[PDB]
Amino acid sequence: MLGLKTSIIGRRVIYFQEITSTNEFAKTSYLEEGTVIVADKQTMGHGRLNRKWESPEGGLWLSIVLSPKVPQKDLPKIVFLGAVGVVETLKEFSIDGRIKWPNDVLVNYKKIAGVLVEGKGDKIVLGIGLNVNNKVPNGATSMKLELGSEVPLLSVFRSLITNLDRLYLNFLKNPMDILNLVRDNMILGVRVKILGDGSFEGIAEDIDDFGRLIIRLDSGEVKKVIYGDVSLRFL
Amino acid sequence: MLGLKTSIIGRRVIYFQEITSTNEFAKTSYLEEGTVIVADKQTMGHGRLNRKWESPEGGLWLSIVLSPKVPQKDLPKIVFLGAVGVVETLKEFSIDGRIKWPNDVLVNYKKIAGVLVEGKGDKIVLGIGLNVNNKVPNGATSMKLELGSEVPLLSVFRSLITNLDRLYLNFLKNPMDILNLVRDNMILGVRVKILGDGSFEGIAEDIDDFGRLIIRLDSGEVKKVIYGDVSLRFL
Ligand SMILES: Nc1ncnc2c1ncn2[C@@H]1O[C@H](COP(=O)(O)OC(=O)CCCC[C@@H]2SC[C@@H]3NC(=O)N[C@@H]32)[C@@H](O)[C@H]1O
Ligand SMILES: Nc1ncnc2c1ncn2[C@@H]1O[C@H](COP(=O)(O)OC(=O)CCCC[C@@H]2SC[C@@H]3NC(=O)N[C@@H]32)[C@@H](O)[C@H]1O
Ligand SMILES: [Mg+2]
């Protein structure tokens, strides 16, 4: 009854009033590619590492099941599909979102969405959390806060699924295309701090052909950061 | 992201752009009580006694998994929950839906919806097919044809699910209650022909305390029809 016209992503959609985590459900259950897992709220929303993702009602919390027949080298770009897709849907709603490497979407520097990719077996789970009408943690923002009025969640859902379906289909044919869209939509030419041990600081110059953030330290040294137990903070 | 507020029916919803039959999928798959299976269109939709059910895009084709904790004697009343639920939704949209024993809902004697209940052990699948905006076979009707305008499919879904949840919750507590609702909404006091092992004609006067259709033949003889391998036709 949703009448989705997408080719792959959205062929099936499993909705929950409540759930622990759409990402967890997605990787522990057998699902055909393109299946979307979505819930009104998550009791155990997951961020990177052991971080929690606040998932109260009013937001868009979903996971998509993928099984891309592309070289292993390209898989790390899946997170960018989610991020660019969010940016595209925000634009449709007249909101300018900017990507903060490697998985965040910011609006005027406030986090409005986060992307979490997990790969179990030949299956890949693309998780996306977008604040729409829900209240958010201090420092974050939502579509409702940016526009001044509630946005129909289903309208956002349809827009995002349509955008992701297109990005994904192109990704399967032209896997390097997404990087271009990312460069044109991410925060660069600014100073950042790379936490963790070996912690350093420098200017985020660009992302390379593998999706690595290229940083120029004050000494002129160039480091290439791969995203994992990695965290980027502005300063 | 649908934001359903029902207690049981609709705790989860599995949507398909296309499927063979929601009733088949619901009977076959391991699903929790309250889970709703809905598809834009069915390729192998069916009615009773191996009959085909046209399921083109525009209609509401869904199945609900239930595990009614009531005496085995009350299970046959489940089909009425479906029919009454549809009638209420139709009335909310100002369409005069009336129940035709045993599983149909008509508008001016033209079928607009059919209910098919299929029986496992502790699991019951409540299937409902309601013509909304889809083309229908000659002699049938749709909400769109009745209203002279297209109706938002999602609004009909929300209405029906809300009604069914309330009706189901009450059924668990008072299994006899639905019979009153069936009586106030069923086509009665008219001449009907019952088809089973042979056939006979008479006035459909009412349903009894077991949901059996009471027929009064011209001889004054009273027969009690149990819905099974039988068919009812108006003269
Ligand atoms: N609702 C919210 N809005 C903005 N920021 C939030 C937020 N909830 C938590 N945060 C902050 O963002 C950080 C997490 O950032 P990270 O970069 O590590 O992680 C993320 O940004 C990924 C979030 C992925 C969420 C989706 S929801 C659908 C699916 N199911 C799941 O269980 N997860 C995925 C937290 O440590 C918080 O400080
Ligand atoms: N779309 C339609 N609208 C009105 N009448 C139809 C119709 N499609 C078929 N019919 C007629 O209705 C008869 C079927 O009547 P019955 O009383 O036996 O059976 C029914 O009326 C039950 C139909 C149940 C349909 C739902 S759709 C969701 C779920 N998944 C399924 O596969 N089935 C259920 C057929 O033999 C046709 O003559
Ligand atoms: Mg019938």
**Residue B41 — φ and ψ, nearest 5°?**
-155, 150
Inter-chain CB proximity A17 and B10 less than 8 Å = yes
Whole-angstrom distance, CA of residue A141 vs CA of residue A130: 10
Q: Is B118 exposed, middle or buried (0-12, 13-18, 19+ CB in 10 A)?
A: middle
Whole-angstrom distance, CA of residue B178 vs CA of residue B172: 11
Residue of B nearest to A8 (CA): B17
Residue type, position A156, single letter: V
Segments forming the whole domain that contains residue B226: 188-235
- Residues in the 5 Å CB sphere of ion ligand 3: B 103-104
Resolution (Å units): 2.0
Of all atoms in ligand 1, which is nearest to the CA of residue A20? 32
Close Cβ partners of A24 (under 8 Å, ≥ 6 residues apart): A44, A46
Inter-chain CB proximity B154 and A1 less than 8 Å = yes
Binding site members of B for adenosine? 53-54, 111, 131
CA angle B226, B184, B99 (to 5 degrees): 55
Helix locations, chain A, DSSP H: 22-28, 78-92, 143-147, 153-173, 177-185
Residue A214, phi-psi category: left (phi > 0), alpha (psi -120 to 50), beta (remainder): beta
Length of chain A: 235
**In terms of domains, do B55 and B65 share one?**
yes
| B79: its two tokens | 């089909």
Inter-chain CB proximity A1 and B57 less than 8 Å = no
**In terms of domains, do B61 and B15 share one?**
yes
Of all atoms in ligand 1, which is nearest to the CA of residue A45? 32
Residue type, position A76, single letter: P
Angle between helices B153-173 and B78-92 (to 10 degrees): 140
CB of A130 within 8 A of CB of A60?
yes
Residue nearest to atom 2 of ligand 2 (CA): B54
Whole-angstrom distance, CA of residue A80 vs CA of residue A100: 11
CB of B205 within 8 A of CB of B221?
no
**In terms of domains, do A234 and A170 share one?**
no
Residue type, position A190, single letter: V
Whole-angstrom distance, CA of residue A123 vs CA of residue A82: 16
Whole-angstrom distance, CA of residue A27 vs CA of residue A220: 42
Residue of B nearest to A12 (CA): B16
Which of A145, A108, A105, A107 is closest to A128 using CA atoms? Answer: A105
* CATH number of the domain where residue A127 is located: 3.30.930.10
**In terms of domains, do B2 and B98 share one?**
yes
Query: What residue has token string 């693309």?
Result: A126
Inter-chain CB proximity B1 and A60 less than 8 Å = yes
Domain boundary among A166, A187, A208: A187
Which of A131, A52, A51 is closest to A93 using CA atoms? Answer: A131
Ligand nearest to the CA of B48: 2
**In terms of domains, do B110 and B17 share one?**
yes
Which of A92, A75, A96 is closest to A185 using CA atoms? Answer: A96
Sign of the torsion formed by the C-alpha atoms of A50, A54, A57 and A60 = negative
Cα of B41 from ligand 3 centre, angstroms: 20
Which of A26, A54, A31 is closest to A42 using CA atoms? Answer: A54
| A62: its two tokens | 């979903």
Q: What is the tally of structural domains in chain A?
A: 2
Query: What residue has token string 């009448």?
Result: A3
Whole-angstrom distance, CA of residue B30 vs CA of residue B65: 10
CB of B26 within 8 A of CB of B3?
no
Would you give the distance in Å from CA B115 to the centre of its chain? 3
Residue A155, phi-psi category: left (phi > 0), alpha (psi -120 to 50), beta (remainder): alpha
Whole-angstrom distance, CA of residue A18 vs CA of residue A40: 6
CB of B147 within 8 A of CB of B54?
no
Residue type, position A60, single letter: L
Whole-angstrom distance, CA of residue A58 vs CA of residue A20: 16
**In terms of domains, do B134 and B197 share one?**
no
**In terms of domains, do B3 and B36 share one?**
yes
**In terms of domains, do B159 and B208 share one?**
no
**In terms of domains, do B59 and B172 share one?**
yes
Binding site members of A for Mg(2+)? 103-104
Q: Pairing state of beta strands A35-39 and A12-16?
A: parallel
**In terms of domains, do A147 and A195 share one?**
no
* CATH number of the domain where residue A219 is located: 2.30.30.100
Residue of B nearest to A130 (CA): B1
Residue A61 parent element (H or E): strand A60-66
- What does the H/E/C string look like for chain B? CCCCCCCCCCCEEEEECCECCHHHHHHHCCCCCCCEEEECCECCCECCCCCECCCCECEEEEEEEECCCCCCCCHHHHHHHHHHHHHHHHHHCCCCCEEECCCEEEECCEEEEEEEEEECCCCEEEEEEECCCCCCCCCCCCHHHHHCCCCCHHHHHHHHHHHHHHHHHHHHHCCCHHHHHHHHHECCCEEEEEEECEEEEEEEEEECCCCCEEEECCCCCEEEECCCCCEEEEC
Close Cβ partners of A228 (under 8 Å, ≥ 6 residues apart): none
Which of B77, B65, B72 is closest to B178 using CA atoms? Answer: B77
Whole-angstrom distance, CA of residue A183 vs CA of residue A216: 17
- What does the H/E/C string look like for A195-210? CCCCCEEEEEEEECCC
**In terms of domains, do B179 and B221 share one?**
no
Question: From the CB of B47, is ligand 2 less than 6 Å away?
Answer: yes
Whole-angstrom distance, CA of residue A169 vs CA of residue A35: 15
Give the determination technique: X-ray
CB of B99 within 8 A of CB of B83?
yes
**In terms of domains, do A87 and A144 share one?**
yes
Residue A84: DSSP 8-state: H
Which of A193, A170, A189 is closest to A181 using CA atoms? Answer: A170
